[PDB]
Amino acid sequence: VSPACAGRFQSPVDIRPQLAAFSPALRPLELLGFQLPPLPELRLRNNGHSVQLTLPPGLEMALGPGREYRALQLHLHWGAAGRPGSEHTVEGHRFPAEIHVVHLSTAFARVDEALGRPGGLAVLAAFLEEGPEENSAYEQLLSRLEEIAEEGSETQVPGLDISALLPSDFSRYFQYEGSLTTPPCAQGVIWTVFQQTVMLSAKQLHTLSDTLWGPGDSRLQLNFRATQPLNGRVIEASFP
Amino acid sequence: VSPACAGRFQSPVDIRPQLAAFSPALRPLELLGFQLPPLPELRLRNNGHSVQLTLPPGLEMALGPGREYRALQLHLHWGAAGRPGSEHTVEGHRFPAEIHVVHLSTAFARVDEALGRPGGLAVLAAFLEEGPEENSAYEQLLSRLEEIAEEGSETQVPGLDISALLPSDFSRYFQYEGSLTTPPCAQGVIWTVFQQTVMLSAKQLHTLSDTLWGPGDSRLQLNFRATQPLNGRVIEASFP
Ligand SMILES: COC(=O)c1ccc(SCCc2ccccc2)c(S(N)(=O)=O)c1
Ligand SMILES: COC(=O)c1ccc(SCCc2ccccc2)c(S(N)(=O)=O)c1
Ligand SMILES: [Zn+2]
Ligand SMILES: [Zn+2]
């Protein structure tokens, strides 16, 4: 029963853009090394809570000058047939799905030293919505979900352009301080939520929500935490 | 002799208010437990680089919701007769002196763990200027310098209200991330520089700069580092 999961400053949150603070010090995010060669392959796992892709060393992310991170992994949150499952909401709207790319501050060698430390971990988050076309970067992961239908299963996938899983607009985002959304829910996590969304086909969103199985003989669906109150935190925005 | 002194994100810096970014998310500083009783006494020490007062446990400081610190020590930077010695400057203007109250994040149990980690240490900085009245708060410290004029000397002083050494409006400050201004010049220090100043008499300012002796047979004077480039860092302001 991680006591951190009862902290005052938890994630995810409902983003109310009218209450967000415009902060012009929030510059465009910068990503280096995200365009991977096909080999070595990466490991894609059904962990019973999400599908998680382990990322290789060398993916560097900066929130700004002096604010440097390395990417660890990415995973997804999703709903069910006719039910949205983003973690974050905007003005109470929940989107079909959400991607999280979790990073470690370059000041720490291990996750366990960064847990609960200010700015020790940073998450990049983007909503997934339905578009008309099959998203080619997503297809490389989604086309392998059948291989990992079973809880605790994994498979290897070719490296891909990891930045193609995210929006092209890196300028416009909300940022706030919060927590991991799974035990141990440690605080001090810098959350960056893109304004622009990513487009998947209806078929892709259905593959995501209908393929994977979780604890027991239950479908892995609706794997989002309820929104947590801001409790006086102010969400910042990189635009007015 | 410490290559970190040549890092990219060093302190101090020149503040250019018109180029600061206003972020309404920067709330008034909260400083609790700073009104110390006369007992126990505190160590005041000439360390040959500054005069330093050791602070007891219980001085709690927050830069924002869930971003808490405990004060460790305070020290000063000053010039010489008719020469200002602040560390920060404002549009190129050097103030007569500067006070620094150094704090440790509650997320770290030791200073050595915090050095080089983002937001591990936070310093509150205020400019000291010349005014016509004698300053009662500062007198408690200045009146005791004669006793510690020898490099390496120390004395015990009565408890004092540390918060009385600071400016009037805790809602009005600049903020950026930089470094210690002495070796090891570690990065990831959050600097908060009050917009308003504190006034000492000309006599008090003279007492500060003229009583203490440093390494060799030289005066302890002009104990400030040269200003360092922002290198892309944007200074934030808590007010438009
Ligand atoms: C239902 O969602 C998940 O399965 C999930 C898994 C991991 C993580 S991050 C953990 C980083 C970590 C922590 C401890 C040890 C080693 C790695 C998150 S999140 N949304 O970013 O908080 C969700
Ligand atoms: C010439 O100036 C100084 O004497 C001076 C001394 C200490 C400090 S902070 C040290 C924090 C610390 C470091 C290591 C171990 C334990 C405490 C600073 S400053 N201006 O805050 O960078 C100036
Ligand atoms: Zn997540
Ligand atoms: Zn100092």
Residue numbers in the entry:
A (entry chain B), B (entry chain A): 19 to 258
Would you copy out the relevant sentences from the publication that reported this structure?
Humans have 12 catalytically active CA isozymes (EC 4.2.1.1). − The enzyme catalyzes the reversible hydration of carbon dioxide and has many essential physiological functions. Since these enzymes function in pH and electrolyte homeostasis and regulation, many drugs target CA isozymes to treat diseases like glaucoma, edema, obesity, epilepsy, infertility, and cancer. − Primary sulfonamides are the most investigated CA inhibitors. − Their amino group binds directly to the catalytic zinc in the active site by forming a coordination bond and inhibits the activity of all CA isozymes. To investigate this phenomenon, we synthesized ortho-substituted benzenesulfonamides, determined their binding affinity to all catalytically active isoforms of human carbonic anhydrases, obtained crystal structures with CAII, CAIX, and CAXIII, and performed molecular docking.
Figure shows the interactions between CAII with compounds 4c and 4d, CAIX with 4d, and CAXIII with compounds 4c and 4d. Meanwhile, a hydrogen bond is formed in the active site of CAIX and CAXIII through a water molecule with Gln70 and Asn65 or Ser64 and Asn69, respectively. These amino acids fold in their 3D structure to form the active site of the protein. The corresponding heavy atom RMSDs for 4d and 5b are 2.18 and 0.92 Å, respectively, and despite the RMSD for 4d being above 2 Å, the binding mode is captured by the docking reasonably well, especially since the receptor used for docking was originally bound to a ligand from a chemically different series.
